[PDB]
């Protein structure tokens, strides 16, 4: 009905955080609807979101990150609905970047590596990465690999000979925080030699 879901991003712009909410029914009429968050904030008591087309969002440093908050879908001033979320459990990591496969001639293996700005962050600095890859000829059948570091090694012995592979990564909070998978990294395409 007026159901919605949000995801927070901590230290997404410097030390500033961001909370983002949207209705689950994409066709809901949002020209009278308002989003507001109260609780677990500091200098202030509540914050008013900013509509940016279909989605509502806040950018502040005023999140305490301890205890639940109350996000409400207000209509003028009537609380149509509200949920009590703990901004530290709906974190969405920034997507990994600088993906890069490298073929080591000697060891007959490829060394996949990537970067995540989360390493220098102070809060969400522990992530569980998901490296995904498949072969051009194949479809919807990806091979996933869960990593915790930013380096992964595939063996030629395990990858089809003379073929073009597509590989990509994405991260999810994994230590104290909880949340959702980040957007996928841009894909990287490499070819395996002719055996």
């Amino acid at each position: 009905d007026y159901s919605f879901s949000c995801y927070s991003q901590l230290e997404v712009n410097g030390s500033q955080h961001s909370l983002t909410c949207a209705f689950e029914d994409p066709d809901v009429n949002t020209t009278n609807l308002e989003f507001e968050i109260c609780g677990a904030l500091v200098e202030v008591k509540c914050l008013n979101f900013r509509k940016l087309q279909e989605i509502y969002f806040i950018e502040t440093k005023k999140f305490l990150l301890i205890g639940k908050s109350n996000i409400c879908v207000k209509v003028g001033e009537k609380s149509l609905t509200c949920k009590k979320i703990d901004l530290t459990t709906i974190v969405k990591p920034e997507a990994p970047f600088d993906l890069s496969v490298v073929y080591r001639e000697g060891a007959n293996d490829f060394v996949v590596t990537f970067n995540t700005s989360h390493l220098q962050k102070k809060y969400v600095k522990v992530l569980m990465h998901d490296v995904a890859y498949r072969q051009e000829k194949d479809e919807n059948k990806w091979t996933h690999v869960n990593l915790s570091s930013t380096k992964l090694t595939l063996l030629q012995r395990k990858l089809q000979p003379a073929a073009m592979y597509e590989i990509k990564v994405r991260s999810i909070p994994d230590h104290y925080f909880k949340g959702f998978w980040s957007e996928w990294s841009p894909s990287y395409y490499f070819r395996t030699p002719e055996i």
Binding site: V42, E43, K61, K62, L64, I66, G67, K122, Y176, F177
Partner: protein, 115 residues
Amino acid sequence: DGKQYESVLMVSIDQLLDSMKEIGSNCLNNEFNFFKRHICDANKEGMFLFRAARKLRQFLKMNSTGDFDLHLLKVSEGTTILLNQKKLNDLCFLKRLLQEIKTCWNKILMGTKEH
């Protein structure tokens, strides 16, 4: 819930102490009365963090908008939520105050893996 401290609350105490690592080696270190009167003594640590958190607010300026004041607010409004006057400007006392707050939190922590 000490996990709350380690992961969220401590981030702010440390940031604050970092903006004050230049100061220190110059003020009459002679402990202030606050610390003579209030100690984070064995199983009485709660009473200390509570007071320490309260003393902290006294360093908040009116225009409480700035990484610095926000970190101060987070530390104490935060320490408070995990448990249950005059304005001050001496950074030596604040610095020492934050250090003692960290230390007290450590006892409460390396002390529950006990009970």
